[PDB]
């Protein structure tokens, strides 16, 4: 993800077995500090989609923001009066789920006085979803191929953008939070994706107060007119034979469990990060779509085969995601950084080894 330079100094490194043993129990639910944006309502007709009643996936033309912490004008303003550590849910999920990661990644941490800002670099593949990252044999094709890791990542990201919006009531008013979406002009309110943000606060002990941007994709009217908030994601199938997977069209109907088990093992980091995003936001449900290519030789046309719903805390149990561990990992990295001088630091995942390394880097590096 990044080229280590000769003047970078290793501060501390930790292997996955030790990271897996970190623990910070007793962390309370996030507390909302500011809520903004606007979401569309879920279209429950997508709950009746199944392999015998597939629905083509539509191309949706909307604005999808992925703004890093220090570029976020709400975080910038909040940081003047609240907290001492700042991040976004996507950045936190990468750190919290690091022991499930295979592919390289990095996060820049800036220390300014008693404050830490966690950022992603914008020019990288940080935002793209990975595909078969944790398979025994991850995708092997070289650049050109429709099945190269990068092209699969672009396809899955595209699918998720489309799916998350398609299953909503696009032609109906939104559920609005108190403040408007902080990333757009009023003129773009009709163009922006369905997304609402909760900027939330956690006490992580040791004088640490985290403020992070969390989000929901949609709202839904619950059992008795109760407003529920949703995280909506798409699992995808590209070529079951080349993936050595279980064929969704053949198995979703009767062997849903086997299909899901295969996803848990072959996309372990992706799925854990989504679950962390839902937990941090306090989403009532995680909704998964199952999207497949219409034809395995064409990555431009897709179909929705099925949708599933989980309570995030129950799904976490199913994938053995333990938030005591997630919070422990984050606090460990925070402690390493708080012991340093003001300046820039970098945490990164070794491309070939199960470990993370925190570097002291020249402050003009990034």
Q: Which residues, in sequence order, are bridge partners of residue 195?
A: 38
Tell me if 112 sits within 8 A of 330, measured CB to CB. Answer: no
The CA distance from 197 to 180, in Å, is 10
Interatomic CA distance for residues 153 and 132, integer angstroms: 10
Check if the beta carbon of residue 55 is closer than 8 Å to that of residue 43.
no
End-to-end Cα, the chain, rounded Å: 14
The domain ranges of the chain are: 1-366
User: Using CA atoms, how far apart are residues 292 and 305, in angstroms rounded to an integer?
Assistant: 7
Under 8 Å between Cβ of 169 and 43: yes
Is 292:245 a contact under the CB 8 Å cutoff? no
User: SS3 of 59, please?
Assistant: coil
> Coil, strand, or helix at residue 362?
coil
For residue 251, give the 3-state DSSP assignment: helix
Distance CA 269, CA 152 (A): 16
Q: How far is CA 131 from CA 57, 249, 254, in A?
A: 19, 19, 24
Helical segments of the chain, H only: 16-19, 73-78, 89-96, 149-166, 240-243, 248-251, 256-266, 268-281, 312-318, 323-338
Under a CB-based contact definition with an 8 Å cutoff, are residues 161 and 60 in contact?
yes
Q: Token pair of 43, please?
A: 């279209």
CA 88, distance to chain mean position in Å, is 10
Nearest to 342 by CA among 111, 32, 44, 124: 111
Provide CB contacts within 8 A for 328, sequence distance 6+.
22, 23, 24
Distance between CA 153 and CA 63 in Å, rounded? Answer: 19
Those residues with Cβ within 8 angstroms of residue 225's Cβ, 6 or more apart along the chain or in another chain: none
Cα–Cα distance for residue pair 101/232, rounded to 1 Å: 22
> How was this entry determined?
X-ray
What are residue 244's phi and psi, to 5 degrees? 55, 45
């Amino acid at each position: 993800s990044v080229t280590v330079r000769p003047d970078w100094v290793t501060i501390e490194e930790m292997d996955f077995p030790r990271l897996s043993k970190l623990t910070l129990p007793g962390v309370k639910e996030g507390e909302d500090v500011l809520c903004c944006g606007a979401v569309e309502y879920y279209d429950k007709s997508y709950d009746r989609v199944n392999v015998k009643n597939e629905k083509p996936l539509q191309r949706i033309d909307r604005i999808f923001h992925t703004v890093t912490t220090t570029d976020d004008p709400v975080i910038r303003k909040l940081s003047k009066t609240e907290g001492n550590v700042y991040a976004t849910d996507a950045i936190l999920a990468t750190i919290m789920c690091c022991t499930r990661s295979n592919y390289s990644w990095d996060i820049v941490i800036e220390k300014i006085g008693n404050k830490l800002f966690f950022d992603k670099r914008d020019n990288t593949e940080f935002d793209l979803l990975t595909v078969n990252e944790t398979s025994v044999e991850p995708p092997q094709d070289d650049g050109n191929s429709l099945n190269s890791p990068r092209n699969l990542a672009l396809e899955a990201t595209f699918i998720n953008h489309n799916f998350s919006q398609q299953v909503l009531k696009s032609n109906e008013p939104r559920y609005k939070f108190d403040e408007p979406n902080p990333f757009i002009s009023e003129e773009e309110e009709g163009e922006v994706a369905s997304v609402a943000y909760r900027y939330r606060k956690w006490d992580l002990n040791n004088g640490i107060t985290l403020i992070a941007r969390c989000e929901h994709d949609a709202v839904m009217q619950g059992p008795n007119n109760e407003t529920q908030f949703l995280t909506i994601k798409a699992l995808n199938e590209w070529d079951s034979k080349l993936a050595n997977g279980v064929e969704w069209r053949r198995k979703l109907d009767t062997q849903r469990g086997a299909v899901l088990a295969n996803e848990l093992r072959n996309n372990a980091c992706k799925l854990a990060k989504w679950t962390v995003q839902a937990l941090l936001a306090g989403s009532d449900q995680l909704k998964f779509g199952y999207v497949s290519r219409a034809s395995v030789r064409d990555s431009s046309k897709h179909v929705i085969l099925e949708t599933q719903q989980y309570k995030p805390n129950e799904f976490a149990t199913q994938i053995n995601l333990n938030m005591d561990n997630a919070w422990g990992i984050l606090r460990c990295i925070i402690d390493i950084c708080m012991n340093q001088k003001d300046g820039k630091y970098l945490i990164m995942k070794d491309p070939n080894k199960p470990m993370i390394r925190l570097y002291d880097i020249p402050d003009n590096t990034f």
